[PDB]
Amino acid sequence: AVIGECMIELSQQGAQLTRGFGGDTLNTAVYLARQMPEQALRVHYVTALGTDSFSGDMLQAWRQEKIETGLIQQFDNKLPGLYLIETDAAGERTFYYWRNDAAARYWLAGPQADALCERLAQFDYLYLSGISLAILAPADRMKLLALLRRCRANGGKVIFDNNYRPRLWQSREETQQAYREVLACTDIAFLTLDDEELLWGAQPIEQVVARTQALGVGEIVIKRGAHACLVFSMAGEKLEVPAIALPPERIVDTTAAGDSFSAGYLAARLNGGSAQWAAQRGHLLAATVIQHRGAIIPAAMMPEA
């Protein structure tokens, strides 16, 4: 289960702009589903959307991506969040967001939530990002943490990605408390080095691993972009897996690289692959994604798994 939020995405180049959908948790869920045939549990997305046409378009696209919509609550009064991407003459990307009252924020506020909680309590594996925690209000955040703990009690494994966007959080300290809270309830953590250092300050890799493990995390994955990835295993293995080198000519606009790595590593890792091999799979997926336009690149250009 991927807990999180998708948004309506508007891409404007010059005077021509187009409509679509995008979100970090959705990028991970779609990319995971793309390379995954089947496994112990295949339920993917736990967002909330509106009853409007745009939500239905998103849901149909997600079903075409082999994503179940069973747990997506629909609010008549609420409407989905919307963001815009702008590209300057140089090609730089600027992002604007309108998600303060998005439907996904109230997914734990729904009347049916308790039912889904119990259902989600028995789920095999759940994935969430720092954005997912951020959008939730503090009371809703406590509810989500309790559900995560119950999922641990029923044998479930929690996956957390530390996508850190300061805007969503009231303060740095609030982010620190919430991150510690979820990592306390977390079993596997995907940590991007830039986000980690931005949140806690620059530190050696060892103090980072110590801080996260003291909370109780079993497996720690550190993403370093173009630099070698760092995996600390469930057993205790410590390995450094290089990313595939890419010439500057082929580097193109890609806002989904890290999410794609989270999905690709996880797709191989949950399919019996080794940690080194899963990191390799994620690196190839990320490189292919960074060579093509768009957050969700076409299925044709995807790496054959």
Which residues in this chain contact its own copies in the complex, by CB under 8 A? 201-207, 225-228, 242-243, 245, 248, 251
What span, in angstroms and rounded, lies between the C-alpha atoms of 47 and 78?
13
SS3 (DSSP) at 17: strand
Provide, rounded to whole angstroms, the least separation between the CB of residue 169 and its own copies: 15
Nearer to its own copies by Cβ, of 157 and 283: the residue is 283
Nearer to its own copies by Cβ, of 243 and 278: the residue is 243
Q: Mark out the alpha helices in 185-274 (DSSP H runs).
A: 193-200, 205-215, 257-269
Q: Which of 161, 187, 195, 259 is catalytic?
A: 259
Q: Are 296 and 22 in contact (CB under 8 A)?
A: yes
Provide, rounded to whole angstroms, the least separation between the CB of residue 204 and its own copies: 5
259 belongs to the catalytic site: yes
Nearer to its own copies by Cβ, of 182 and 243: the residue is 243
Nearer to its own copies by Cβ, of 51 and 207: the residue is 207
Provide, rounded to whole angstroms, the least separation between the CB of residue 211 and its own copies: 11
SS3 (DSSP) at 188: strand
Backbone breaks in the chain (C–N > 2.5 Å) follow which residues? none
Count Cβ atoms within 10 A of the Cβ of residue 258 and give its class: 0-12 exposed, 13-18 middle, 19 or more buried: buried
Provide, rounded to whole angstroms, the least separation between the CB of residue 291 and its own copies: 14
Q: Which residues are known to be catalytic?
A: 259
